[PDB]
Design a protein around this nucleic acid. Structure first.
Ligand SMILES: [Mg+2]
Ligand SMILES: [Mg+2]
Ligand SMILES: [Mg+2]
Ligand SMILES: [Mg+2]
Ligand SMILES: [Mg+2]
Ligand SMILES: [Mg+2]
Ligand SMILES: [Mg+2]
Ligand SMILES: [Mg+2]
Ligand SMILES: [Mg+2]
Ligand SMILES: [Mg+2]
Ligand SMILES: [Mg+2]
Ligand SMILES: [Mg+2]
Lengths: 96, 206, 81, 129, 217, 87, 25, 97, 121
RNA sequence: GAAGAUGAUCAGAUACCGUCGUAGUCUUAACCAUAAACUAUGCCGACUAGGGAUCGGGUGGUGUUUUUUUAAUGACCCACUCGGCACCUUACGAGAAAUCAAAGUCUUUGGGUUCUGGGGGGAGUAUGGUCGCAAGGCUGAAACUUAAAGGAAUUGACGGAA
């Protein structure tokens, strides 16, 4: 009978079964747990201002071989420390 | 539609009973259960020779409807039907393949053995399975000399006969040649027997 | 066979088939007018009769039950139905 | 256990029509089966069908001619308003020009075309095309 | 024509069979591409994909080139041919031959009204090759081919003006996608509609009518 | 199929199997067409005039081509006592 | 790394973790 | 994937058979799986029959036999060349030679 | 190591196929006519081809050879296979018939001279 | 015969191998509740294909054996039949394929129902609850990380495989 119940009065089993199996998605689990506000440094937001603490030079992953020229940024709205890439040629000379 | 003479004459019944064309296989295919008549103890089934003659005459009517006669290809891979196929070939138009079929004969249009029959007759649908399989690729009707155990896969006109005996195979090919010539008009009258007597169609040693 | 008469199957086929798997299901059992060598009276005994059947006047066992048909015992005579 | 004799009947009809048989045998032969088969026969998808009366539930031998592609059952018998018959026809039928969605309607068991001409609707049984 | 073997060729390139529907009616096997060249002269060709396929050798990876070619006039016929060869030009040159030999008819119809000159398919059809399922649905006028740009090209060379398409399976496999769509538009004559229900008198094959012209000596 | 002004638009109305009524399609290469000769008085062949049966590839590949052809030949009188309706 | 022996390694890690947790509690 | 339909053994409808021991290494192998060869030898030789019959009382004695059903495991039978690994199409053959 | 290649065997086969009313069981005669009926590019290859032709002719003289197809072999095999025995099998040399085969005759509605023997299972 | 003891060998010090040997293996009373607990294939129902072999029961042979002048019951043979463990051929069909008479009757998608899965790790982890004398069992995340992991098959290469 292809798995699921089919009968006319079996809508609660289908609805609760979809509600239970709906949690295995990444986006539904993330959105209903609200992990963008609990974690993930920008608290659900797109952009955030911070204050540079130190310029880092990150080793690029293999097989690439370069220094990636990032900064360590402490966010104003959280106090969380993140690492941010300064994304062009030069441009680490531009920050401070 | 066949008026009165195409009934099984008692002389033809003498031929079919004396050649043991009515001795069917012990195991009977479910598609060949129509041709069985009341299996005897020891398990040997009895082929209905009336239905054998009717299917033989129907096969002869199908053979004598292809306009040119040299593309009614007669197949025998078996020693009991080599001479029967070659004499059928000599008496009718009837391109023979006596011996090895050489696969790629009905497909494979660049071989030396490339034929396009409008009809294929086979002595045995088991041993001649390559001819039937290859005729299933290029739209060719198949008349077979089936037994009660031989498969009817891609077989359109199954003449139920004894495949084990050489006398049965040679007689059925002889009768098919005779009926095709009678339908063509090469034999003048259906009532007199053919002057060709049935022992040039049997396998011999030596 | 790809074409057949299912309304009128042959009696040899219907007598081969199971009693539930025929066109209309009915029993293959029957009843027997059975008389003893001794007594003159007639007893109606089932074929698959499950019971040591006696007469009303007899003391004698007419049939003994088995796995299928009852075995009509001891030289008694029978007639169908 | 046996929950839909119409589904069993129409499955037997499909399975014999796929293998090319000219007849089926159907057990156990309900009124819904008889009316569904009468609609199919009216539209030409089967031939004569004959009801064997044993004294229990009946059997049917249907003569399948050659013209059936897929008869089937929509289980459960969904409630079908008159506005969404055409969703069901667009879903189940191969074209707008043929094929019929059979409805159980309080004016009788009928296809969707003369459900529309009678302006009636109701539960869905299945389809034939 | 060009010294034909295969009796069908000796009839077609002599002039006894003049339309390709006479071949398609009797299901005559076509083994020479010049039959299709004479009967369908306006049979345009489109290479859809060239890919390299490799076989690991005792020393090295030998590669051949596999071409899919869709041929077909835009009035009801296509052929899909797939051929691998050492060179891409040989792959095209022989894939055109295989696609010419594989020409089948499709059944255009209507989304539904019989206002003239069929634009869409007559029936929802499906086809499978590998994992790829391609379903074609009849579509109204002006819908166009709602298909991926290879299935769309095959249906454009089929003369389909309007069709909807569903697809399942790994459609990035272009060979399987094109073979599934090819099976799907082959199945249009697979389907038996009520307008085809009428009994027909079952004609005689051209190989029987013109048996003298075929099988030349 | 036709349009609104008559005008049959088919390009080709396909043949049908004489046994199972399926459409024999253009790449059904196992399908055959069998011509049986029409036998006149005193048993000649009448070259040209046939009794024609089309069998699809399905029937032959399932092995019922022989029994189907027995039925359709007996219905046209080419056989007398070969095919029986009640098996 | 066999999954059986990695499972046994994590099972020993379970015992050490609950031993130190019962030590603190 | 499934290399064999009867998975390596002969167990259709049991769930448990019993284990026996290999004769070469005493591995515990199930009785249906094991590999079972009946060794029926003469008690003397193919060549010492003449010596024993010449230096035997009771003329035409019996030349008796010894009987031993041997259960091997798969590794021991393959190593002793009792079963000898087969091709994909040929391993379906269940004929004794 | 005296195996002959296909360029020897095929050429020799073709020479017998179209020149049987010619070349005989003698290698020197075959070698001399291989210069005239064929253009063999070397003396060693001509000698090999003529020697294999001689070997196959000596082989044909005691029973035919498969693969060699000349016009005389068809005719002699056909006049050897045209044998008809006058002892006339399938004729009534006494019809020994079983009980079910007698029932077959009666069901067919024909009158045959039969001889029924009981069959043991 | 875990542990443990001991004898050899090994580059490191092959844990394999030899001889002992505790717990254990067995049983009673109570616990545990897991296995590649596998057919890696939930349960009920219907239909679709041929075949032979076998197990249990039933039915029929004017069958064989108990030949004793029309020879019980068992055993056997033959044909049916129902139920079962399976098997062989084919691929109508299905499948990514290996293969499958079910893993078929599925884009021509609906017979009834329960359970489970949602890329790989982290992780069957942390924590909470509950069960257990314990070992642990059942339930069971997240942060973080990652562009593949994997399945089937083909060609090659390699094998202390033939
Ligand atoms: Mg997708
Ligand atoms: Mg492996
Ligand atoms: Mg187990
Ligand atoms: Mg578990
Ligand atoms: Mg499991
Ligand atoms: Mg349950
Ligand atoms: Mg059974
Ligand atoms: Mg996951
Ligand atoms: Mg758990
Ligand atoms: Mg816990
Ligand atoms: Mg795995
Ligand atoms: Mg793998």
């Amino acid at each position: 009978g292809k798995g699921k119940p089919r009968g006319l009065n079996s809508a609660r089993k289908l609805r609760v079964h979809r509600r239970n199996n709906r949690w295995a998605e990444n986006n539904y689990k993330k959105r209903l747990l609200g992990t963008a506000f609990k974690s993930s440094p920008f608290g659900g937001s797109s952009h955030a201002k911070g204050i540079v603490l130190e310029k880092l030079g990150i080793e690029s992953k293999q097989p690439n071989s370069a220094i990636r020229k990032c900064v360590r940024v402490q966010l104003i709205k959280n106090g969380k420390k993140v690492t941010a890439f300064v994304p062009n040629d030069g441009c680490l000379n531009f920050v401070d | 539609s066949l008026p009165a003479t195409f009934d099984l004459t008692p002389e033809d019944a003498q031929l079919l009973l004396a050649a043991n064309t009515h001795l069917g296989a012990r195991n009977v295919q479910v598609h060949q259960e129509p041709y069985v008549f009341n299996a005897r103890p020891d398990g040997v089934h009895v082929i209905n020779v009336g239905k054998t003659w009717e299917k033989l005459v129907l096969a002869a009517r199908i053979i004598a409807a292809i306009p040119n006669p040299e593309d009614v290809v007669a197949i025998s891979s078996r020693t009991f039907g080599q001479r029967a196929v070659l004499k059928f070939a000599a008496h009718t138009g009837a391109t023979p393949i006596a011996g090895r079929f050489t696969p790629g004969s009905f497909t494979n249009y660049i071989t030396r053995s490339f034929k396009e029959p409008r009809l294929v007759i086979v002595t045995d649908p088991r041993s001649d399975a390559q001819a039937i399989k290859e005729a299933s690729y290029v739209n060719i009707p198949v008349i077979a000399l089936t037994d009660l155990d031989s498969p009817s896969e891609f077989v359109d006109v199954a003449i139920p006969c004894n495949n084990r005996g050489k006398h049965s195979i040679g007689l059925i090919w002889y009768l098919l040649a005779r009926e095709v010539l009678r339908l063509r008009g090469a034999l003048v009258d259906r009532t007199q027997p053919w002057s060709i007597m049935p022992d040039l169609y049997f396998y011999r040693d030596p | 066979v790809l074409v057949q008469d299912l309304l009128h199957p042959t009696a040899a086929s219907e007598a081969r088939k199971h009693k539930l798997k025929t066109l209309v299901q009915g029993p293959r059992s029957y009843f027997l007018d059975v008389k003893c060598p001794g007594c003159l009276n007639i007893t109606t005994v089932f074929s698959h009769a499950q019971t040591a059947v006696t007469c009303e006047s007899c003391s004698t066992i007419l049939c003994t039950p088995t796995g299928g048909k009852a075995k009509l015992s001891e030289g008694t005579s029978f007639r169908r139905k | 256990t046996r929950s839909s004799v119409l589904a069993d009947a129409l499955n037997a009809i499909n399975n014999a029509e796929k293998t090319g048989k000219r007849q089926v045998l159907i057990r156990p032969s309900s009124k819904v089966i008889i009316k569904f088969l009468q609609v199919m026969q009216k539209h030409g998808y089967i031939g004569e069908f004959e009801y064997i009366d044993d004294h229990r539930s009946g059997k049917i031998v249907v003569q399948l001619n050659g013209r059936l592609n897929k008869c089937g059952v929509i289980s459960p018998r969904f409630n079908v308003k008159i506005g969404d018959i055409e969703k069901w026809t667009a879903n189940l039928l191969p074209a707008r020009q043929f094929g019929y969605v059979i409805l159980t309607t309080s004016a009788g068991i009928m296809d969707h075309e003369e459900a529309r001409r009678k302006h009636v609707s109701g539960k869905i049984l299945g389809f034939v095309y | 024509g060009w010294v034909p073997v295969t009796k069908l060729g000796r009839l077609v390139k002599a002039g006894k069979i003049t339309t390709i529907e006479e071949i398609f009616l009797h299901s005559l096997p076509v083994k020479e591409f010049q039959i299709i060249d004479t009967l369908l002269p306006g049979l345009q060709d489109e290479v859809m994909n060239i890919k390299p396929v490799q076989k690991q050798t005792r020393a090295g990876q030998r590669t051949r080139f596999k071409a899919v070619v869709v041929v077909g006039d835009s009035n009801g016929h296509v052929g899909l041919g797939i051929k691998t060869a050492k060179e891409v030009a040989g792959a095209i040159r022989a894939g055109i031959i295989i696609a010419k030999l594989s020409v089948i008819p499709i059944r255009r119809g209507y989304w539904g009204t019989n206002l003239g000159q069929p634009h869409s398919l007559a029936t929802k059809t499906t086809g499978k090759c590998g994992s790829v399922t391609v379903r074609l649905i009849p579509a109204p006028r002006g819908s166009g081919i709602v298909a991926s740009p290879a299935v769309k090209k095959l249906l454009q060379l089929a003369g389909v003006e309007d069709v909807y398409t569903q697809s399942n399976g790994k459609t990035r496999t272009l060979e399987n996608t094109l073979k599934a769509a090819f099976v799907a538009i082959g199945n249009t004559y697979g389907f038996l509609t009520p307008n085809l229900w009428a009994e027909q008198p079952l004609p005689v094959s051209p190989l029987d009518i013109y048996s003298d012209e075929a099988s030349a000596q | 199929m036709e349009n609104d002004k008559g005008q049959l638009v088919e390009l080709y109305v396909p043949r049908k199997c004489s046994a199972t009524n399926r459409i024999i399609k253009a790449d059904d290469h196992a399908s055959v067409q069998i011509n049986v000769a029409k036998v006149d008085e005193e048993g000649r062949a009448i070259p040209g005039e046939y009794v024609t049966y089309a069998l699809s590839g399905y029937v032959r590949s399932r092995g019922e081509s022989d029994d189907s052809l027995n039925r359709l030949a007996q219905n046209d009188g080419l056989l007398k006592n070969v095919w029986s309706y009640s098996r | 790394m066999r999954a059986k022996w990695r499972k046994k390694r994590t099972r020993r890690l379970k015992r050490k973790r609950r031993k130190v947790r019962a030590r603190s509690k | 994937p499934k290399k064999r339909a009867s998975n390596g053994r002969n167990k259709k409808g049991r769930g448990h058979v019993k284990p026996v021991r290999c004769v070469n290494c005493s591995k515990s192998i199930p009785k249906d799986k094991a590999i079972k060869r009946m060794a029926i030898r003469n008690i003397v030789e193919a060549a010492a029959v003449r010596d024993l019959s010449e230096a035997s009382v009771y003329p035409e004695y019996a030349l008796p036999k010894t009987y031993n059903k041997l259960h091997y495991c798969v590794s021991c039978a393959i190593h002793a060349r009792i079963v000898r690994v087969r091709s994909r199409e040929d391993r379906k053959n269940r004929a004794p030679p | 190591g005296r195996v002959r290649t296909k360029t020897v065997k095929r050429a020799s086969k073709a020479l017998i196929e179209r020149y049987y009313p010619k070349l005989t069981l003698d290698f020197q005669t075959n070698k001399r006519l291989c210069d005239e009926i064929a253009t063999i590019q070397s003396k060693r290859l001509r000698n090999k081809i003529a020697g294999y032709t001689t070997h196959l002719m000596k082989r044909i003289q005691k029973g035919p050879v498969r693969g060699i197809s000349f016009k005389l072999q068809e005719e002699e095999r056909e006049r050897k296979d045209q044998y008809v025995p006058e002892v006339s099998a399938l004729d009534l040399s006494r019809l020994n018939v079983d009980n079910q085969t007698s029932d077959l005759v009666k069901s067919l509605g024909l009158k045959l001279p039969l001889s029924v023997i009981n069959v043991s299972a």
